[PDB]
Amino acid sequence: IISTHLAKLYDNLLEQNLIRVIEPFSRVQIEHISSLIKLSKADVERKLSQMIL
Amino acid sequence: MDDKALLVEVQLLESKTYHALSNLPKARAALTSARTTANAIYCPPKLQATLDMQSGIIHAAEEKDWKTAYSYFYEAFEGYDSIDSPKAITSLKYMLLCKIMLNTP
Amino acid sequence: DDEFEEFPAHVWEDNWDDDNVEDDFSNQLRAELEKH
Amino acid sequence: DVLPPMLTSDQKPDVMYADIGGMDIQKQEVREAVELPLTHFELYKQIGIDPPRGVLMYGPPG
Amino acid sequence: LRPGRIDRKIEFPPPNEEARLDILKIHSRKMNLTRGINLRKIAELMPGASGAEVKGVCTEAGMYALRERRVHVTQEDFEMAVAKVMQKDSEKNMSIKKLWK
Amino acid sequence: LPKNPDLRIAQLRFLLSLPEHRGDAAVRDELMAAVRDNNMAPYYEALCKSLDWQIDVDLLNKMKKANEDELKRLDEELEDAEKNLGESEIRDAMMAKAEYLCRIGDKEGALTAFRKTYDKTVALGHRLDIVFYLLRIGLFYMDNDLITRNTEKAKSLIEEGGDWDRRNRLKVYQGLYCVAIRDFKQAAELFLDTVSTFTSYELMDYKTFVTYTVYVSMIALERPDLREKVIKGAEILEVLHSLPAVRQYLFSLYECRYSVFFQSLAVVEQEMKKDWLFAPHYRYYVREMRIHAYSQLLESYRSLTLGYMAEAFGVGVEFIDQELSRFIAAGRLHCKIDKVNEIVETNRPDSKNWQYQETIKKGDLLLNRVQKLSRVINM
Numbered sequence: 001i002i003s004t005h006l007a008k009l010y011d012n013l014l015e016q017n018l019i020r021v022i023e024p025f026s027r028v029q030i031e032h033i034s035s036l037i038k039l040s041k042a043d044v045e046r047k048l049s050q051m052i053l
Numbered sequence: 054m055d056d057k058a059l060l061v062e063v064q065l066l067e068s069k070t071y072h073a074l075s076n077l078p079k080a081r082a083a084l085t086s087a088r089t090t091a092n093a094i095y096c097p098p099k100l101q102a103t104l105d106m107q108s109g110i111i112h113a114a115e116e117k118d119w120k121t122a123y124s125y126f127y128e129a130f131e132g133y134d135s136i137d138s139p140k141a142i143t144s145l146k147y148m149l150l151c152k153i154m155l156n157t158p
Numbered sequence: 159d160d161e162f163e164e165f166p167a168h169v170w171e172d173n174w175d176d177d178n179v180e181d182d183f184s185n186q187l188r189a190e191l192e193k194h
Numbered sequence: 195d196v197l198p199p200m201l202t203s204d205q206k207p208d209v210m211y212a213d214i215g216g217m218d219i220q221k222q223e224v225r226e227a228v229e230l231p232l233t234h235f236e237l238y239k240q241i242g243i244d245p246p247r248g249v250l251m252y253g254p255p256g
Numbered sequence: 257l258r259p260g261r262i263d264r265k266i267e268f269p270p271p272n273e274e275a276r277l278d279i280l281k282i283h284s285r286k287m288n289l290t291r292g293i294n295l296r297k298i299a300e301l302m303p304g305a306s307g308a309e310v311k312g313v314c315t316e317a318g319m320y321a322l323r324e325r326r327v328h329v330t331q332e333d334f335e336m337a338v339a340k341v342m343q344k345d346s347e348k349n350m351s352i353k354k355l356w357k
Numbered sequence: 358l359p360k361n362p363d364l365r366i367a368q369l370r371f372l373l374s375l376p377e378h379r380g381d382a383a384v385r386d387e388l389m390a391a392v393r394d395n396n397m398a399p400y401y402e403a404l405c406k407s408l409d410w411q412i413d414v415d416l417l418n419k420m421k422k423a424n425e426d427e428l429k430r431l432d433e434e435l436e437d438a439e440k441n442l443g444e445s446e447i448r449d450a451m452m453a454k455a456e457y458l459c460r461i462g463d464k465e466g467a468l469t470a471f472r473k474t475y476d477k478t479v480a481l482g483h484r485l486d487i488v489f490y491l492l493r494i495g496l497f498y499m500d501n502d503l504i505t506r507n508t509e510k511a512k513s514l515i516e517e518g519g520d521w522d523r524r525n526r527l528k529v530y531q532g533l534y535c536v537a538i539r540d541f542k543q544a545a546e547l548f549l550d551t552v553s554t555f556t557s558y559e560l561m562d563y564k565t566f567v568t569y570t571v572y573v574s575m576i577a578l579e580r581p582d583l584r585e586k587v588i589k590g591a592e593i594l595e596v597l598h599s600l601p602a603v604r605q606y607l608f609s610l611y612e613c614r615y616s617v618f619f620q621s622l623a624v625v626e627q628e629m630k631k632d633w634l635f636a637p638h639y640r641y642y643v644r645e646m647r648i649h650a651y652s653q654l655l656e657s658y659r660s661l662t663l664g665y666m667a668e669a670f671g672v673g674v675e676f677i678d679q680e681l682s683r684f685i686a687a688g689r690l691h692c693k694i695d696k697v698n699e700i701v702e703t704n705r706p707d708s709k710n711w712q713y714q715e716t717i718k719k720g721d722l723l724l725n726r727v728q729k730l731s732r733v734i735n736m
Contacts, residue, residue, distance in 0.1 A: 001110055002150050009154055050613060052657035053580065074598055076591040078325050121218055169501060170539045174687070175644055182643040184623045190672045226319060240327045242286035243318035244311075291522035325591070328521070328554060 014039075014047060057094045061087050065107055077115040084111050102132025106144055113151065123151035224249060270306050273299060279310040287318065288328050298334050305342055312341040358526070360559045361459045361490055366391055366400075367497050371633035373408065378631065398424045400462030424461055431457055448477050455487075459494055467494060468503075485514055485523050492530050493559070496537075504534055522556060529557045529566075536573065536634050539641065545570070545577040549586050552593055567596040568603050572625065572635075575610060576645050580653070584611065610650065616671025618650055647680070648689045655692055655703050663699035674699065 014037075021036045022028060030048075034041045068083035084107055091104055109125035112118050126147040133141035152158065180186055211221065231238060231245035238245050257265070271279055276299040284295065302313065317337035321329045347353060369388040372378045392401050398421050405412050435450035455470035468491070475487045488511045495504035511527050528551045535544035548570040555563050574587045587593050588611055597604035606621030608614075626643045629635040635642065654669065655661060667677045681701065684690045691705045706714070 001113065002146060005113065005150055005154055046613070049654075049657040053613065053653065074595045076595040078591050082324050118218070120215070124216075175640065182626060182640045183619070183647065184626050186676065187619055187623050187672070190676050194671075194673055226322070237322055238318075241288060241318040241321050241329070243315050243322070246315060246319065288521045291520070326553065 015051065018044070018047065018051070057090060058097075058100065061091050061094070061096075061100060061104070064090065065103060068107060068111070072111060072114065077111070081111050081115060084108060098132045098136050099138070102129045102136070102138075102144075105129040105132065106147075109147060109151075113147070113154075119151045119155050123148055123155075126151060220251070224251075270304055271310065276302055276305065276310060279307050280314065283311050283314040287314070288321070290328055290330050293329070293331050293334065297331070298338065301335065301338055302342065309341055313337045316340050358486070358489060358557070358559050359456075361456060361493060362395065362397070362462060362497060363391060364493070364497060364560055366397075368633045370404065371636065372631055375631065375636070393420070395460055396420055396423050396427075397460070397462035399464075403462075427457055428454075444477065448474065448483075451477060452483070452487075455490070459490060464494065464498060481514065481518060482520075485511065485519070488514060489523075489526065489530070496530070496533060496560075499537070501538070504537075508534065525551050525554045526557050529555070529560065532569075532573075533560060533634060536569065536638070539638055541573045541577040544573040548573055549590075549593075553591070564596060564600060567593055568600060571597070571603055571607055572629075572642070575607060576642055576649070580611075610646075610653070613653065615650055615654060615669050619647075619671055622646055622650075648684055651681070651684065651690055651692075655690070655701070656705075659703050661701045661703070663694070663701055666701065 017037050034044050064087035068080045071080035071083055105125045106129035109122045113122035126144055130144035227246045227249040277295055280295040317329045317334045320333045372384055431454045438446045438450045451474045455474055458467035458470050471487050471491055478484050488507055491507045528547045532544050532547040552570050555566050609618035626639050629639040663674055667674050692701050692703050694701050
């Protein structure tokens, strides 16, 4: 129960962080969002793709 | 037949199995049946707190009413604390989890 | 109006793809994993 | 001309479902009786039911 | 009530047996009943219940079905509907009740 | 409802017919076990003639004798009912006759007997029961004409005053027929409208039904609807706990894990080829799910490096090049490759541009129709 709920919390927190971080930004290098949120390039890329789909 | 307390026990076991299988609507149906049958007989502290904890788990999973989920979790925690039961740490963990997911850490 | 007599004369909405392939997507993928 | 022509239901309420605590059962029943017939009446057609227009609440003084 | 102004005086007795069945059918036609719903059994379980009660029983079975994301009404659902509709509140003041032998 | 006959019989026959499983010792043993148990003499003769099998007279003779004796007692009882009892029992005797005919597999005899019984009968319930037996015989022998005919028949009878259990059963029958005729949109609609109410255990197990619902849903549903009605679905996700290879297939696509998606798609292909209702659809299902996967990946990109896309899909660069070329040519995808510097640009059309093209096409159709009308009637 706690594992599932906390995983969803992680997902929502990451989504909010990406949205706020990239609000003051048109075209952006993905390495920059990775630097700003302190995650891996691959993970941020996958989450961004999921957001867009 | 007799032993309506065991009726409630079996119904809650079925609800736990339903939720484990992830059929939340049917788990909720089983929980509502268990609670209606529990509001006609004596619920020892153990069964009352177990019903409360299962209610908390189901509300946490499905309805997204984490305030009520916390309420039921806390009733379960108080009951298990009164009974001096091993599984009160789990209830307290769920309490903290509700207080987190409510975005009030 | 007039039948042009001077001219002598499944239920699946198929649309090509009836090609000849090394199975659709089983042996291809097997060999793909094998060479990767 | 036909001039498009009041008394109650214009002082928009303030309390909310987040404000009311507990009484999940009462909220469920009042909602199924009051709101859903107005938001999702297809759910009622499917079962083939007449929505329960009219419900009564018991209770101590407050 | 003189038989010069109101000539006839019809009575509407509370639907008896199998008249309750007729009302159950009438108010359950537009419904989703399973193979194994015994409207007769519902009728017997409902003694001395007015046609309003029959309508309410069907409606409450339907609302119970609405509850569990389901479009089917079952015998047990009708039973719970009967219980929830025919609530016979009874005074608990045993003294006021035993006043009369 | 009864099993007239076990459609597992058709499954076994078609599995044997497939060349890969012709020499299946088990399959053969189970098929003949069912044949002997239920005494299908004409069907067994047809199997022997079609599959070029060495007949076993020592048991075929006993099987014929049993069939003859049972039919004789049935029709004797029918005559007795005719000369002694009323329609209420003459009809039942005829029903038993037709039931034995179908259970032995004499297609012509069963069809004739059921037609006669339907002509005799007047009760709606038993009329529907006979129609259902006819639908299931039609499904057994894949006779599209008969299946469709009884299908509108059954719709008419239920519309003329029916019941919800038979509505669900007809819905499942329509779904199986839609899978047969490759109408997976209707198949998904019906299956998802009657997954919570699976009552037709004669056609297939509930595991098989949920697997079919998942397959048809994935091929026929958009991502929003798929999430709402197949991943957030009570029963359709309950059974996927017992089915581990299908849960992975569905959740790979939804979570956008694609290499696992192709692994599970190869699994599903080899499963459906063996299957008997999906057998003339596996090429199409595989191809359309591949297109769904590629379009899903490229729906959130504008220039996807071919190497990265290959790594995501768990394949190479050459395989991806070949298949993207094929699908772009077919016109399904919206993507143009650039092989010098391997990059797959995505030329998706904007909303305005797509609306323009739709207006051109649909207006062209309407213009053709009106032009025909006017040219015809003006002069």
